[PDB]
Amino acid sequence: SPTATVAEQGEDITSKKDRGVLKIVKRVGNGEETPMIGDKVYVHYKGKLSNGKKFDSSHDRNEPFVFSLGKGQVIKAWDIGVATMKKGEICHLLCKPEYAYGSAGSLPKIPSNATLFFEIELLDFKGEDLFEDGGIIRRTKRKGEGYSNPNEGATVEIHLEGRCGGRMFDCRDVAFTVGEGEDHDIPIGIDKALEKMQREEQCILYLGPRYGFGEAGKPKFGIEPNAELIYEVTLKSFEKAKESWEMDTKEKLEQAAIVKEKGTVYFKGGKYMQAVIQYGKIVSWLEMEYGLSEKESKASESFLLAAFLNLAMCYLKLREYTKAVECCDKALGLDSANEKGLYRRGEAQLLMNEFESAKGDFEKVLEVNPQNKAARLQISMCQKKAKEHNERDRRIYANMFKKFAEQDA
Amino acid sequence: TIVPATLPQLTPTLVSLLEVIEPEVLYAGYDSSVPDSTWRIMTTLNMLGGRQVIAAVKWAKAIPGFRNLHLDDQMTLLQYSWMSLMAFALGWRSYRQSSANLLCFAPDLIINEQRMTLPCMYDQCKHMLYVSSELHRLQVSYEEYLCMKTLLLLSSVPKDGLKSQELFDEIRMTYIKELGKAIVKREGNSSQNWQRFYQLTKLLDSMHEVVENLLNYCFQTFLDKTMSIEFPEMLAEIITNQIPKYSNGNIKKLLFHQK
Amino acid sequence: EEVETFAFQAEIAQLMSLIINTFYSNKEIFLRELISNSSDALDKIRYESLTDPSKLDSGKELHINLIPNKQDRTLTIVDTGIGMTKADLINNLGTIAKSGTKAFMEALQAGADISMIGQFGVGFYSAYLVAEKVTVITKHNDDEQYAWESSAGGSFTVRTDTGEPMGRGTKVILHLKEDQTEYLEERRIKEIVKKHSQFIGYPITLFVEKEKYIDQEELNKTKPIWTRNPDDITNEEYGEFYKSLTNDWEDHLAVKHFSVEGQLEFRALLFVPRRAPFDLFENRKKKNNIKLYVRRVFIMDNCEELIPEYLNFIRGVVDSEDLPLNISREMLQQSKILKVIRKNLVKKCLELFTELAEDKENYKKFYEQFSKNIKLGIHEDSQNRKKLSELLRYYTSASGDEMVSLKDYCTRMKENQKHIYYITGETKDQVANSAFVERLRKHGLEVIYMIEPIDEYCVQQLKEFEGKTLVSVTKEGLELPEDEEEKKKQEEKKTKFENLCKIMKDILEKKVEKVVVSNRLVTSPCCIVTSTYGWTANMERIMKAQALRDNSTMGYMAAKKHLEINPDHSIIETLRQKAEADKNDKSVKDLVILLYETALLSSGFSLEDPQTHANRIYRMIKLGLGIDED
Amino acid sequence: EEVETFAFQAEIAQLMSLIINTFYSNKEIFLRELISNSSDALDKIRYESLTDPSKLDSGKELHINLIPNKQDRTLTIVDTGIGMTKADLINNLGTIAKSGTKAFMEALQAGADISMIGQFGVGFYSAYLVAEKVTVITKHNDDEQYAWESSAGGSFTVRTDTGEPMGRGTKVILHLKEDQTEYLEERRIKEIVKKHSQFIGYPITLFVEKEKYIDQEELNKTKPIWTRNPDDITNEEYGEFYKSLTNDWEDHLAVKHFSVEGQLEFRALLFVPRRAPFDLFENRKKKNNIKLYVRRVFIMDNCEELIPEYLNFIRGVVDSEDLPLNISREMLQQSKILKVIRKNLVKKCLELFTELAEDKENYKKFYEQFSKNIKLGIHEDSQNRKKLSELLRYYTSASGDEMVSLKDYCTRMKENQKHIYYITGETKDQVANSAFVERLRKHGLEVIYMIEPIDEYCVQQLKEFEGKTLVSVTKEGLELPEDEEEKKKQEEKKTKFENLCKIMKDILEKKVEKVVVSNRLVTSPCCIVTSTYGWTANMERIMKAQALRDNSTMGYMAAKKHLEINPDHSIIETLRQKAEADKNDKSVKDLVILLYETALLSSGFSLEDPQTHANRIYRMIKLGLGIDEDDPDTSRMEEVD
Ligand SMILES: Nc1ncnc2c1ncn2[C@@H]1O[C@H](COP(=O)(O)OP(=O)(O)OP(=O)(O)O)[C@@H](O)[C@H]1O
């Protein structure tokens, strides 16, 4: 059995000389010859146990095995593996028991030392992942602590190269807080990228069209690739954000007042993303049980309702009536007569071409405030738009049955 | 005139659906050059715990019947039984990986008897190994095991009940029925199936003690500050919110079987 | 003619063989019989002690001990009953078909309450079903201890007992057959005792060895509470009894404790579960659930003859006295008796449900689990439809989410109604919003929404309720209490629309029996309606979905279809005008098809093309979307 | 010590009572026993006459006569068998457990072929189930005639018979109970006799007075044939027998005649009818139409233990001469015997079906009537599933119009075709033209068309044929052996329309689990498929329609709908571009819904509320025809807080 023969054969790939990995690789194909590091790399493979036994597993279905982390994660044999893997390489790397199923093993089914090698056809391994929402390309040099990351509310110390997309901007080591994504012109998506970064993590961060200032066209950067703001960022230190379950009842009310003012400013400044962020913190705190008396609970409701309504407007400008609708619904669940929410939701509906719901909301605005002519105007507009749509249909569909009868020659 | 047709029975799939839903085991461990100090062991376990606990949430969401519960209740059940489920998962993995009453947590994490160095384990070995020893003694299979695991998800309620109670009760009977079937088709017995069912139920009922005692220890580890232990925010939030529910008696235990 | 007279004789050797080899179907019963005789022995002494307490001077505890002995491969059964004198060991154990018990009973005063297990004189001998040798040790108060022994070879012996004193009572020792050792196991014993003898009045203790010491385990802990006057039993007691009886954990939902004192005498407890029963553990599929006991001894548990299947969710016990039984005591003689019992069981089940229903919340809990069975009882068991139907509950248009009784529908009827209107369909919502009920809603008439597949089977039998006729609103010929002026208008409409009726029939020739002008629709231009005699769309879809089929089933049950036209509809007026202007306008042809086809779906029929429907729509979409022909 | 030894005794009075009152439940069997005694009497003389022919000098006809007498409430049974001498008369009728028959056989040499019915010694007394008194007159060749007479009073008498000579044999007269005259009626007799005798080796004549004269009818004209060597029986003979037994004007379709030797002796005949019974699965009476006889005497019927229900259409008889019976001879004593019988009967039925299948014409006739039973067997019988599957026949997309074998399928399959594909649905037309098979047909792959609702059960359990698994073409993940170039082209298509997948999903968030780009379609703009697990279309509607079911299970088992889009349809391409231009375009929203509703109908799902689909259509008609007649403070909104 050739797969058993190779159990003790191969070139030396080591960490440990008496264990390690046997390079029994049959060939290198079609792809870059450089060993590569990267995420979401899918490979196909078939194989056998080091003792020559056919393995009863997913390789017989050509499983598209994925390498989830840049330097590997779930198969010690293949992660030790990635370090020497090339695109197009057809690997046969037999890794001794320390790389098999671990100290526990996968027993009851598989003993810890029942190792394998497979004929693995490799996909390009260069490059780590981007982002769940897209907008950023992340590449790493050094892992951080692994037990600690910034969370919004914490100031962080970030080393910045000064570089950005082959160009320079006011990129400097910064004792960054989240509001700075807009206040200090620091690419805005950094606000969330930092929460995944671990202390002392070294990562190259590309901030794309909506993650960076591409769409904004900020002249402050003045970088032709304003939409590709890529440079090294190192998270060197940070403080700990106090969590909403760590913060006290009064502490959360106090911060809601502080944050509310920041949010108001951001809103007015056109910094709707930051306004949303500040209002986001306000709402998540306020939604929690505080143990307040009935009159004290109104400080919470006041901050909460205001945040919903401010968010609704931020979203009316940032998003096409999506979260804005939800915010209004929340504002109205809290206060069914708040004409601001009734009105703003009604606009969100009209602006999505939902004429019936828009009219209903504006009618409600006027029950609360019969003099709020804004709703009266919106109702008239809803009616007019509905008329326009009805006319378009007549232009297309009128007398189609005849058209069809004649086409049918 | 008309005779209603009889009904052939469709392949029951709840057990195989659960087999599909169950997640793969996660890795945990630490740099072996570091001794297994009280705080290192706890840290390794805490990080694994938070990751396994979140996997348990999507796992629960994926379960037929469960998924139709009001979301608040779905999350309530996960908190109240998070310990039950984790302990059960551990106990089974242990005894199947080895007949020894060890704790098998991850591909790289085993706590053998000589490694039960945490004060918490020394005091709770009688509870954490209650479960692995008993499942071993009864030679519990994977499938009847899964049926029981699901019932543990459904083993506790608020003292004030759930909103979708008239579903919850259905879901429990549904999985009770599946457990019965899981036993009958494998044992080949009659009166002994009745008894095996009760013998297994008794684990799940006695596990209420297993959990309160283990629970109080996890509360103590998180609450005090005597050990250099990192904890994930997830578990820390759960415990912060769970401690007063426990101490106020707001969590009700369910009794699965008598007779 | 001198005539010789002879007595009858018997051959003992063969008689013994029949006793052992051709009366019994099983071996469980060897224990059952030994225990029964033992309990009678105890009861006899208990009785004697009533007038002479000194009878118990030799010992007062009346109990039965089962003592298996694996090492010796034996089983010993011990009691403290009367015991036997030397004379009785010889007469009663040495005589086939002698019955000491019977003689005892015969010798009793008329007022005696000794509900003795009666007997034939054969049963002891069943011991040899499992034993190679049987030894009986006994002490009677009036005699010495003696040891009786036999291998049933046509003799037996009597020895003076020189061993340990008993005080009083009988000890039976079986020396078991080499290959039947399961009777030495705890599990087998417990199953047998529980199954046949759990209601014997004297405590039974099983003595076994474990780490060593002997574990004394009582088995018959439950009392046969049905023997008590019903008024003295609390709900907790019924509940506990029930749980032990059925190995449940839930309590009963309802119970009826009933007795009969006529030609036959018996008592029974019938329980209604709080949850529909299910096969938690393997059993005979659809075994019925009423057990029959005679004199507190289990006799039979799956007698189909006792109760209709629709009432098989009732759990319960019937305990009779003095029924003629088969020699094996496994079966009842004269099955005409079962017929009588069934009559009474059903009669009382109905009273229970009638009463249960007074509690609206509980009725709901009931009905949610058990409505299917009620409905089967309508379909079947025709003599009871008149009462069962009152237990039905339905959603109606005026009920919102409440279900109401048919009597509620009735009380709310208008003076012009002669009929109860109902509609059937797949879901609530599809029925409630249907075109078929638009004019009924207009005039404020109540409609019943029938939903379950079962409802279609059932509706066929329920022709009349309290004198009102039940009618469907999906059949042609629906009668509404309309005025003369509208009727005249309808005729005028027929006159102008008949041209379409004919044209549409020429179109679409094979799809309908006819096309008519209708007075039932408001907003729909049309619908598909069923014939007066025939089957509805719902019936067809049900029949076409069943596992059990024939060709004749639908060759016979297929529905006829008729197309109804809303005269008052704007599409319809357009067609009248267009079609009259040109009978061959091909666009009319296509419009006729879409109205029909759409009507088919909206009326509950499967669309068989089905692709053609989709294709017509795709063409319309291309236009709507601005996609040209090429 | 001194040990006394005693014999066992019996109390005759009680013994007599028990035999009469507790051993039997069916009074009618008294006739069965009187006849059995009689046939033994005849057979015994026949045996003796084999070596000594003078034994029959006293009379040569061996027969049984039944002579009811209305007028005197009596029944007489007459035979010409050995008869009894005075000594035998007293010893055998006066001893409760004596069996002369048993002794007789014991007195014979090994090799005698004769098999008697009796052996217990008590059957005679069953006469008293219906008789008040009985009289027995008998003549033995070696003695005079004697008349035995008694009530079951503990004693009996013997008289010299001073009446007419009977030549030879025994005459039994019952004086019937005043209330038991139903057994005196010609109809009832004949029915009992038919039921319990049927295959008695000697003829029975029933003598009935009519306007008078006596009508002498021979009962049991039909002889058992299973006792004969099968090689010796013509097909017509089997058919004649069959028709007689079943009152079937039609002949049998197939028959299997076999025997089993060793431990339990068997002979059996199994017949396959040419028509399925109309109530085959509906009758509420027991389904196994197999009768069990012992020594040619009927014992039992309607026993579930003998045959699995799926084979409840086989008509037949099982006969043995060695099984233990209870005292009434109404059942076997050891139920484990039935287990063995069943194993063998089933094995042979399957052999018969296999043989039948070789005749293509006959198999078709069979299958047309009984394919339901085969399919049920697949569902219920886990052991013979592996053979039963060979008997299935289905229409396929490449069979034209005849049904073919699963083997036929797999012998036409293509080198890269690793899987067997099938579709299920209401009718052949619907499946044949379904969107789901458009690519498969285009590539030349064969699809099995399953139609019956029961087909849905077989597809669960069959799983694979000769290692080739089954694939439903209505589920997600359908795999075709596509080329690399084809895959690359699809990869590019799949990075397009992503926005549509998302937009449509938002529109349909509450309707579908997913919206994806697909490849099973080549003509049609879209379709609905079900995910890997759960009920599929058809399976779900079937379950909903079951008359009796637990509806709560439908909250667990239900389809998970995925919407597949055909990227190379013009509707789809237009929407792609249009939707990208405006995410809220009202017309996009409206058209997406119609495609969805349409796809459900064409995909085999019911539609949730038809009075919407219809309304969408009605307004389109009105536009199409031009029928438009009925279808023609503010600053607070800006405030920031
Ligand atoms: N344990 C005992 N103690 C005292 N007397 C006994 C005992 N067992 C049997 N006998 C006596 O022996 C007699 C023999 O009756 P046997 O018990 O054989 O009938 P049976 O088993 O009651 O009959 P059946 O099976 O019809 O119920 C009884 O009538 C009784 O007087």
Ligand SMILES: Nc1ncnc2c1ncn2[C@@H]1O[C@H](COP(=O)(O)OP(=O)(O)OP(=O)(O)O)[C@@H](O)[C@H]1O
């Ligand atoms: N018509 C008859 N002619 C000759 N002998 C008879 C006749 N009827 C009865 N006998 C004799 O009486 C004996 C007793 O018969 P009986 O029917 O009681 O016993 P059995 O047939 O063994 O009972 P079972 O049918 O239960 O086995 C027979 O063995 C036989 O010798």
Ligand SMILES: C[C@@H]1C[C@H]2[C@@H]3CCC4=CC(=O)C=C[C@]4(C)[C@@]3(F)[C@@H](O)C[C@]2(C)[C@@]1(O)C(=O)CO
């Ligand atoms: C006594 C408690 C109970 C423990 C846990 C019991 C259940 C469990 C099962 C597993 O498969 C993995 C981790 C956990 C979830 C656990 F092992 C660890 O997290 C550490 C733990 C909380 C504890 O040991 C601590 O005191 C640490 O705070």
Ligand SMILES: [Mg+2]
């Ligand atoms: Mg007795």
Ligand SMILES: [Mg+2]
């Ligand atoms: Mg006889």
